[PDB]
Fold this protein.
Amino acid sequence: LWEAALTYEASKRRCWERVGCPP
Amino acid sequence: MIHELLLALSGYPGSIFTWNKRSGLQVSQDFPFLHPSETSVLNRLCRLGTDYIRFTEFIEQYTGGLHGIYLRAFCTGLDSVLQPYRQALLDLEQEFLGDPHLSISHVNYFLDQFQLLFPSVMVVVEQIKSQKIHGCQILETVYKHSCGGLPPVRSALEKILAVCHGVMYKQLSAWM
Amino acid sequence: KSPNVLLQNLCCRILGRSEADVAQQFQYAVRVIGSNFAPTVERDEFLVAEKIKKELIRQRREADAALFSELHRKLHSQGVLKNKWSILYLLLSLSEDPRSYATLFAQALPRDAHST
Amino acid sequence: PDDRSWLEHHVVHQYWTARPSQFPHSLHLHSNLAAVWDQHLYSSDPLYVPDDRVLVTETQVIRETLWLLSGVKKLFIFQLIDGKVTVRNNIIVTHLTHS
Amino acid sequence: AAAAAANLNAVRETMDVLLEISRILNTGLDMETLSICVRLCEQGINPEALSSVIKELRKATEALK
Amino acid sequence: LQQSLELKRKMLRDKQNKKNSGQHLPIFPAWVYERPALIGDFTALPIGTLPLASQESAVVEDLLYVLVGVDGRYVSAQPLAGRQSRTFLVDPNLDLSIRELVHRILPVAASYSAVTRFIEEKSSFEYGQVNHALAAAMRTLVKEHLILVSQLEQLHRQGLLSLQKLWFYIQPAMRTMDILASLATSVDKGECLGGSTLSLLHDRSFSYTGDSQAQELCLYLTKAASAPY
Amino acid sequence: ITEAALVRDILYVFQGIDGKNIKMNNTENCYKVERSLRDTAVRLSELGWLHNKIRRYTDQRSLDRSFGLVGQSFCAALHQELREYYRLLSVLHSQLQSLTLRRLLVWTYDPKIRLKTLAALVDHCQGRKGGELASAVHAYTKTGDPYMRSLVQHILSLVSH
Amino acid sequence: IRRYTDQRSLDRSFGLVGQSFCAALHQELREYYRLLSVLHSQLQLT
C-alpha cells in the first residue's frame, strides 16, 4: 500500500524563509 | 546570509560587506558563527563582486569629454556580457531553495569562468578612462584585446565589437 | 504486503503476463529467493561507492562518478533510509552500456569469521 | 475569537497592527541571519538598549513595493514626509538585519 | 497529519533521487518496478539473488517477442 | 637515494649521443627526488601491566596504521633508507606471545616499503617508457589494498575486531605484497629496461601459475608493460 | 586539541588555505602542526604546497598580455583543470553534518600525481613561448604512463589550436 | 605441517609440481586459521 501511495504529486510552491521542509 | 551575499554580489552592500571606493567589499568582522579560516575564502570571492559593482557605475554615467554614440555602444555590449552573470545569480538562489548543506566552495567553483573575463575588461575600461579616447579609436583597444589569450574574453569582447560596427553601419549608410 | 506475495507483483511487472497466465516463473523464484532473508556478506557503504565509481571509470566518465556523490548527498540530507547499500548493489548489478579478474579486487567481509 | 482568528490567519494584520508575531522557519543561519548578528552584537557588549522593531515578513515587502509601483499614494511604509518617499526604518526581518 | 504528509513528501523526494540514479547508469528498470525492488530491499534479502531472479525474468519476457 | 642521481645522467649521456634530433628531454624537478613524503612510509602507555584484551585493541590499531605506512606508538620504522629492505623495532613493554604474532605480521610492511619506493624511483624517463608502464600498474595494486584496509578500520571502530580476525583478513594480500616485493628486487638488480623486463616477466608468467592469485598479477603486469613496446 | 578540528583544518589546506591548529611555517616547508595523526597529516598536506605554486603563477600570467596567445591558453587550461579539483573538494566540504576514509588518504591520491605533473609542466615551459613551448609540451607526451599520457594530450591539443 | 611449508616455499629448485603441491597445502593452512577465527569469536565458553 505504502509505496504505491508514496508516488503522489506534491506541491511545487516553495518558500524562502522555510528551509527545512517547505511544503 | 545566502540572501545577503546574493545582494552583496549584486549592487547592494549591507552590514557585512561594506562598500567603499578606497576599498571595496570589506570584511573585518569576526564571525564566531562561521569557521575562522572561511574569511580567507570570502576575500577571494569579493574580487568577483567588486568588478561587477564597478562595471555598473561606468554604464550609468556614460549613457567636451567622454561622450558620443560610441560611448552608447561599448556600455550596451557590456550589458550583454554581464547577462550570463545575472542569470547565474538567480541559479544560486534556486539551488539554495532545496539544499541546506550548500557551502561557499560551490559558489566559487560555479563562477570560475568569470575570474578571467572580468579583470581583463577592467583594464580596458580603465584605459578608456585614463586616455581621453572618445571617437572611433575606442574600437582599436578592443580590437587588440579581442585577439585574446583566454577563452571567455575572446567571445565577450566579440559581442561588444559587433554592436560597435552595427552603429557604424548607420553613419555609413547615410553617407554612402 | 507480505514478502511472499510481493514477488508475485514482480513477475507481473517484468513480464506482461498475469500471475495466473504464468506461474511457473513465480514457482521458480520462491525456490530461489527463499533460502535466506539476509545478505551473505556484511556491508559497508564505502565499498559499494567505490564499485560504482570503478564502473564509471571503466566507462571513462569521471564527472558522472562525482555527480553520484552529489546524489548520494541529497539522499543523506533527508536520511530516511538505512538500506542504502542494498538497492545500489542491485542497480550496479543491472547496469548497461550505451555504446578481467576479481581475485585481487577488494570484496566484502565474508561472514566466515562471523557468527552465522 | 473564531472570527478574529480567521482574520489573523488568512489576512495578515500583524505588522500594521500591534501584535508581536513569530515564525520559526527551521532557523540556523542561512535564513536566520538577523537574529544571529543581533546575538553577536549583544555578546560583544553594544553596550545594550536593543532596538524594538516590527518584524515584518518577506512577501509583504514585495507586495508593498509593487503597490508603490502602481501609483498608490500615502502608504504604510514609504510614506512621504517631505515630498520624497521616505522608507520606514523600524523594519526587521529574519535575515539581512535591515541594512 | 500535516507534518506526516511533509515526511511523505520528503520520502518521495528521496525516491525521485533514486529514480535519477537509476537512469544515469542506464538500466532497463522503470519507476513502477523500482517501487517493488525498494520494498524487497527494505525487508532484507541477498541482492545478488534478486539480480539473478531479475536476469532470469528479463529473459523470460523475450519469449513474448 | 644518492645513487640514482648518477644513473640518470649516465643513461642520458648514452641517449645524448644516440639522439641528436630530439631536444630538451624530460627531467622532473629536484624536489621530486628530495621529498620524503611521496612514498607511503616514513600516547604510549605501559601497556604490559594492562589486561590482555586491551593490549589487543591497541596493537590492532597500530598495525593497521603500519600497513598504509604510518608508524605506531610501540613499533618504530628503523632508519635504513638504502637498499630494498626495511626493519622495524617493537617495544618490549608488549606481552611476548602477542609480540611474536606482531613480528610474524611485520614482513608485509617491509613488503610495503620496498613496494612504494619502486613507483617513485622508476617514474623518471631515463629508466624507460616500459618501466613507466610497469610502475603505473603497480600503483593499481596499491589502490585496492588501501580500499580493503578501510573496511577493516570501520569494523574496528565499532569494537568488532580482534587480532585473529585481522590475521585472517590480511592473509590474502600477504601473497600479493610478496610477489610485488620480489619482482621489484629483481627488476632493480638487473637494471632492466626495454625488452629485458619483457623477458623477466615472461619468465615470471610461467613461474607462478598454480594458485592463479599470483598468475593474475603477473599476467596483468605483462599486459600493461608491453603496451608501449 | 581534538581530531574533529584537525579533519576540518586539513580540509582547508587542500584549498591552499591555512588551518587553525595546523599552519604554514615557511614556503620551503610544508604545513607542520602547531600524535600519530600528526604524523599522518604531512603527506596529506603536500597537495596545498603544490597548489600554491600552480595558483600563484597562473594568477600572475592571467594578468600578463606579454605572454602571448600560446601559453595564455595554457594558463587557461591550468585554471580549468583546477576547477575539477574544486568540484571534488566542494562535495567533501558539503557532506559535513564516515567522512574520514583513512582521513581521505585514498581520496586525495588520484589528485596528488595530477598536481605533481602540472607543477613540473610549468617549470619545463618556463621562459618559452610559441613553438618553443609547444616542443616542451610535446616532449611530455612521449611518456609511458597512461594516466599522464592521457592528461598531457588534451592540454597540448588546446595549446596547439 | 608449518615446518614443512617453511622449507618448501624457500625451495625455489622444487619444480612446478612442487609449487602446485605446496599451494594445495597453503589452502589447508588458511582453512585451519579460518576455523581458529570462528572459534575465537565464539570464545570471547566451555
In short: Strands of chain F lie at 75-77, 88-90. DSSP finds nine helices and two strands in chain F.
